[PDB]
Amino acid sequence: RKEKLLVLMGATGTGKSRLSIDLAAHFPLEVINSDKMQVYKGLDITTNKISVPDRGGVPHHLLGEVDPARGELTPADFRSLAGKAVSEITGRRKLPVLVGGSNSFIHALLVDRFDSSGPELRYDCCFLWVDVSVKVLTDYLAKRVDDMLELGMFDELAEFYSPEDEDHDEDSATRTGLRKAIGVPEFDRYFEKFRPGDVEGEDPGRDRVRRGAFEEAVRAIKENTCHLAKRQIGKILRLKGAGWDLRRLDATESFRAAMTSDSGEKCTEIWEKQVLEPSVKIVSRFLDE
Ligand SMILES: Nc1ncnc2c1ncn2[C@@H]1O[C@H](COP(=O)(O)OP(=O)(O)OP(=O)(O)O)[C@@H](O)[C@H]1O
After folding, report:
1. What distance in angstroms lies between residue 186's CA and the mean position of ligand 1's atoms?
2. Is residue 97 a contact partner of residue 26, using CB atoms and an 8 Å limit?
3. I need a surface site. Which of 91, 94, 168, 202 has the fewest CB within 10 A?
4. Are the C-beta atoms of residues 14 and 131 closer than 8 Å to each other?
5. What Cα–Cα distance (Å) separates residue 202 from each residue in 109, 195, 205, 206, 282?
6. Number of neighbours of residue 284 by Cβ within 10 angstroms
7. 86, 73, 97: which is closest to 17 by C-alpha?
8. CATH class of 134-244
9. CA 220, CA 187: separation in Å to the nearest integer?
10. Best mutation site among 102, 109, 179, 232 for ligand 1, i.e. most ligand atoms within 8 A of its Cβ?
11. Where in the chain is the domain with CATH 3.40.50.300?
12. Distance between CA atoms of 256 and 265, rounded to whole angstroms?
């Protein structure tokens, strides 16, 4: 008896959470987060967690409930926690929907036998892959960094900052857990020089370095995001080698339109037609046979 699982895939910021919520208006469902940074409670802004008002009352799992203090949630920990949630949701007769972009979490969860120390499918999957042209994605991702700063990302990180942390001079790649999130390592470099709340006060040529350091942290964040996007896409392209029937949704014009600070009526129209209507149809057919 192999359970049905909808899987929403795509690089960071391609509108996966959005889509999961729009589909809920058509199908009774519940969401399981598959983004490995979003599993931790904390840095709600920095990690781009979908706001609660925007979840539309949809039930979410594996979203902001792991205590970062307890270390990394390994891919094996995830398989266990999420397989439980898949099982529970189906129990309540709603469709479980895996939403996120950590291909390492998606894979650990979905395979038949997990290769614990790695470094077919356990479920009956439907894969929706939301794709955006790199350039549009890139540009949207830079804009989104600006919206995170405008929302207060910097103050969030200044409050998260702690001199008892021993990884300030280290990249996300080898950091552990929530401290790997894009934005944390970048601003640690800035706070290195300008500790939270520290001011110049009177006559320091220091201003030119403060501005240069801030600016540099911001470009680095946009850049790392852009690079992460590239590695995710290539990675997705490789599962589209291992077979995997990915149903591609082209969100490009939705995003282009979303770039305008007129990101509402126009962006919604396009998305409704180009991304949502097609997904409803695919899921609809997946729920039948
Ligand atoms: N929501 C997020 N906010 C901030 N940074 C993120 C977020 N999601 C991913 N990242 C960054 O990208 C890295 C890889 O996350 P990814 O979603 O691609 O899963 P992954 O497949 O396990 O990647 P990898 O195993 O190569 O580290 C994370 O370690 C983190 O630094």
Report:
1. 15
2. no
3. 202
4. yes
5. 56, 17, 10, 10, 63
6. 12
7. 97
8. mainly alpha
9. 9
10. 102
11. 1-133+245-289
12. 13
C-beta of 74 in contact with ligand 1 (< 6 A): no
d(CA 273, CA 26): 15
Q: From the CA of 172, how far away is ligand 1's center (Å)?
A: 9
Pairwise CA distance, residues 127 & 4, whole Å: 11
3-state class (DSSP) for residue 139: helix
Residue 153 and residue 46 in contact, taking contact as beta carbons nearer than 8 Å: yes
What residue has token string 């029937």? 245
DSSP states along 95-130: EEEEE---HHHHHHHHBSS--TT---BSSEEEEEEE
Q: How far is the CA of 142 from the centre of ligand 1 (A)?
A: 17
Resolution in angstroms, to 1 decimal, for this deposition?
2.4
Q: Is the dihedral of CA 255, 139, 228, 156 positive or negative?
A: negative
Would you call 18 helix, strand, or coil by DSSP? helix
Fold held by 1-133+245-289: Rossmann fold (3.40.50)
- The span from the CA of 13 to the CA of 184, in Å, is 18
